[PDB]
Each structure stands twice: as structure tokens, then as C-alpha cells.
Amino acid sequence: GKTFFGQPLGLSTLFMTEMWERFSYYGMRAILLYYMWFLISTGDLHITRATAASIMAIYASMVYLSGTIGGFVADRIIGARPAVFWGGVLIMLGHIVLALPFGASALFGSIILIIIGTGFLKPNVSTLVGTLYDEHDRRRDAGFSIFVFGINLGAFIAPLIVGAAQEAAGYHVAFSLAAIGMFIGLLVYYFGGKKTLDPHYLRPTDPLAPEEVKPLLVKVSLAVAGFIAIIVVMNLVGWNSLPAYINLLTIVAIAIPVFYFAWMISSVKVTSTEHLRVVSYIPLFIAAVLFWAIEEQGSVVLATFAAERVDSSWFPVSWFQSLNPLFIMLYTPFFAWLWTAWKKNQPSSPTKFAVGLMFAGLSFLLMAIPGALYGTSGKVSPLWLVGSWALVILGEMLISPVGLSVTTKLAPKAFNSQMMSMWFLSSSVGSALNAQLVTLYNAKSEVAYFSYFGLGSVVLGIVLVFLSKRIQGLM
């Protein structure tokens, strides 16, 4: 019968829903940094550009960290389908706040709404995609491959459309276009989900038991009281600046995997065999952190280079952000044929982590060339950025599909659900690491910034190549 490229027609609803949410999110990311530059130039925002770059990095870090909790909220409390809807309302509200005739006072309110909203939506839309296929359906992998296609599709047209609207009608209209994009998504999701989505997912599939309610309430209350207490003593000591808070969220985002790691490597009930699998995974987790740190600097550091060091007079600078989802859509049909046809001697999944990290380092090493040859005073060809993005995404084609499968294969049965978080949390730690590194990038440190962090990523990819045989053997 009639399908959506061979899959049930319910996929088209979740295709549209996530395409328009990625449209709203990445359409905002393409102009949010430049919007902060504008507020700084008018004296309305009293921070430096290095701090504004840190905000962008720690913003993304909290979004991924929020994406590790929304799955628990839906599957236990509110339900997957209500989490996508109300998550989308919070995202729409976040963009509406920026569309209002406000300035810097609306930045923190808008950021919180999108952080909470994205955590409810992104994990539970992927969850609803799986619910379209009863088990044994081998169309599942092809359906998710089409789902991620709409993800990249929305991330591609958003910087082009939203960036052009900013040049024509200003920032407030451009931010309203992002809110409208989320509005189109909730329209197709609400009315489309009422026809093809299973009504069982209107409630939590694993609701709380009566004896589970009180301990969960105590657990979330102690974490809030402690986090509030940490903020209290900061202002008393005097560490009450915006870089001080960003450092706090940097520490709490990095301590979560560090505490989870020390919590896992120390337990006795795991015995020796599965204990080495956790130790051997540490070189893999740190490599994912370094890659996602480089990949997420495209919307921060590379966006700064595009506006200041590239002669892009005939088009909006924010259009460079479309290069990241463009190469993904171009690389996917090639790598889809590659991994299946390469039956002879396909490299191990740890090696793909190493080569993926080396290519992310080659992307930054490439960016050090124009500043060393021409200097940092003038403008260079826009082809330097399209070559940098081409390299870092080649590293993503090797790391992103293999990444989650690596953590699951090395995960002991007692750490499985927690090990899965370690993979998703590597994106939050990479952006948390960026919140400190992007401050070092400026006009006079361009060549050094790209050289040291680029070579350091290449060297650490060489080290993983050596350690690849030992880690694959444990699998």
C-alpha cells in the first residue's frame, strides 16, 4: 500500500514534527551569537564577545544534558506524546520571547524555555518513531534513517531562511520566524498524531509505583536544595559574575560523567572481566568529548571567523551554518553504500572513533593555514570554511553511527542504562569544554588556537589507533 518511502505513514508526522523543531532551534543558533554582538555594540548587553561565545557553548551543553532527562519524565510521569507537545510549546514560547521588543533581559528567560522544551521533545520524538514498528520489522533502521533526514533538512534551510529574514526585517522578525517554525511543527504533530499514533503513549508506559513517589521526590528535592545552596555561598564569597555562573554549569556538566565513571569503576558486584570494559571505554568517551567539542564550535568559533575573516559581502554570514547539515545529507547516501559493501576488512568501531577525531583535528589544522600565510588582518576565501566543515563532518560519519553501538557493546548488564547516558552526555561535556576554550579565540590568537587544539586532537586520535586493538578485543 501507500507508504512514506516504504515505512508506515505515521512516520511522515514525526518527520515533519522534528524537521520543524530543528528548523526553529538551528535557525536561532545561526543568528543568536550575532544578535548578542548587536546587543553588546549598543550597550544593552554588558558582556564581552568571549563571554557571549561562552554562553553559546554552555547553552548547547545544557540542551543535551536536558535531553538525558526528558526520556525519564515521559516514560514515567507525563507520557511520550504529551512530552512532545508541551515540549514544543516551551520551544515556541522561547522563540516568542526573543521576538518581543525586548533586549538582554529576555535572553535568560528564552534560554531556559528552550532548554526545558528541547529536553521534553527531542528524546521522545525518536521514542515515538520506534513505536511505529512492531518488533521484527526490519524497516526500522531505514525509517530512522529517513527520520534523521528530516532532522538535517530542517537544520539546512533554517540558517538560509532565518538568516535572510534577519537581513531584510531585523532580528525580532527573524526570531519570530523560528517561533512560527515550531508552530507549524505542533500543528502537524497534533492533528497528524491524532490519526496515526498509538493512543497508549498518551500516558506514561512505566508509571510510578506508590512506593516510588516519595523517594523520587526526596531525590529531586535534595539536588535542588544543594544546587541552590551552591549558588547562595557563591554570592556571599563574591563569585557572582556571569563567567562565574558559566563555570558552575561547566563543572556540574563535567562532574556528572566523572562521578558516574568513578561510581562504575569502583563497584565490586561487576567482577574483573566487565570492569576492564569500563576502563577501556574511557579512551572512547574522551574522544567523543573532543570531537563534539570541535563540531559544536562551528556555531561559535567558526561563526565568528565567518563574520570577521571571510569576504562574504554578497550573502548573510549566518548561511555558513547550513554547511554542517549540508555535508551530512551529502555524505549519508555514500556511507550507507560504503559500510554494507565493505564486507572484506571494515575497520573496528574504536578505529572509527580515532579516525573521526583526527579528521576533526584536521578541520582545525586547516583553519590555521590562512592566518599563517595571509595574516589575520584581511579576509580570506569562503572556501576555507567549506573545507573545514567538510573534514569535521567526515569525522562525524565515522563516530556518530558507531558511537552508541560501542557503548552498548562494552556496557556490563548492571551499567547498561547508565552507560547509554555516557554516550549522549559526551555532547554536553564537549560543549561544556567549549564554554572555557572559546574564550581563548580572538584575532591575535587565531593561528595558535587552531594549531594547538587541532594538533592535540590529531595526536589523541593517533593514541586511540594504538589502543584500538585492545578495546575491540574486549568486545
Ligand X SMILES: CCCCCCC/C=C\CCCCCC(=O)OC[C@@H](O)CO
Give min distance, CB of 427 to ligand X, in A: 13
Q: Which residue of the chain is nearest ligand X when measured via CB?
A: 456
Which of 274/367 has CB closer to ligand X?
367
What is d(CA 128, CA 279) in angstroms, rounded to the nearest whole number? 34
Give min distance, CB of 433 to ligand X, in A: 6
The verdict on whether residue 26 carries a ligand-binding annotation is yes
Give min distance, CB of 20 to ligand X, in A: 13
Give min distance, CB of 7 to ligand X, in A: 19
Taking the CA atoms of the chain, what radius of gyration do you get in angstroms? 22
Which of 270/279 has CB closer to ligand X?
279
Which of 173/443 has CB closer to ligand X?
173
Give min distance, CB of 428 to ligand X, in A: 12
Give min distance, CB of 322 to ligand X, in A: 17
Phi, psi of 246 (to 5 degrees): -60, -35
Give min distance, CB of 152 to ligand X, in A: 18
- CA neighbor of 357 nearest in space, from 307, 401, 292, 274: 292
Give min distance, CB of 42 to ligand X, in A: 14
Which of 87/143 has CB closer to ligand X?
87
Local structure of 403: helix, strand or coil: helix
Local structure of 103: helix, strand or coil: coil
Give min distance, CB of 71 to ligand X, in A: 12
Kindly state the cell numbers that stand for 135. 518488533
Q: Which residues contact 117 (CB under 8 A, 6 or more apart)?
A: 87, 88, 89, 90, 91, 92, 93, 94
Which of 98/148 has CB closer to ligand X?
98
The verdict on whether residue 35 carries a ligand-binding annotation is no
Other CB atoms within 10 A of residue 88 CB: 26
Dihedral Cα 111, 128, 421, 465, nearest 10 deg: -110
Which of 179/274 has CB closer to ligand X?
179
Which of 108/466 has CB closer to ligand X?
108
For cell 512506593, name the residue. 211
Which of 152/388 has CB closer to ligand X?
388
What is d(CA 445, CA 134) in angstroms, rounded to the nearest whole number? 54
SS3 track for 10-63: HHHHHHHHHHHHHHHHHHHHHHHHHHHHHHHHCCCCCCCHHHHHHHHHHHHHHH
Give min distance, CB of 40 to ligand X, in A: 10
| CA atoms 334, 340, 343, 345: torsion sign | positive
The verdict on whether residue 427 carries a ligand-binding annotation is yes
Q: Which residues contact 293 (CB under 8 A, 6 or more apart)?
A: 430, 431, 433, 434, 437
What is d(CA 182, CA 175) in angstroms, rounded to the nearest whole number? 11
Phi, psi of 413 (to 5 degrees): -65, -25
Phi, psi of 444 (to 5 degrees): -85, -15
Which of 6/456 has CB closer to ligand X?
456
DSSP percent split of the chain into helix, strand, coil, nearest 5: 80, 0, 15
Q: Looking at the DSSP assignment, which residues form a beta bridge with residue 4?
A: 7
Which of 456/473 has CB closer to ligand X?
456
Largest CA distance in the chain: 68
Q: Looking at the DSSP assignment, which residues form a beta bridge with residue 310?
A: 380
Known binding residues = 22, 26, 122, 427
Query: Annotated binding site for L-glutamine, which residues?
Result: 22, 26, 122, 427
The binding site for L-glutamate consists of: 22, 26, 427
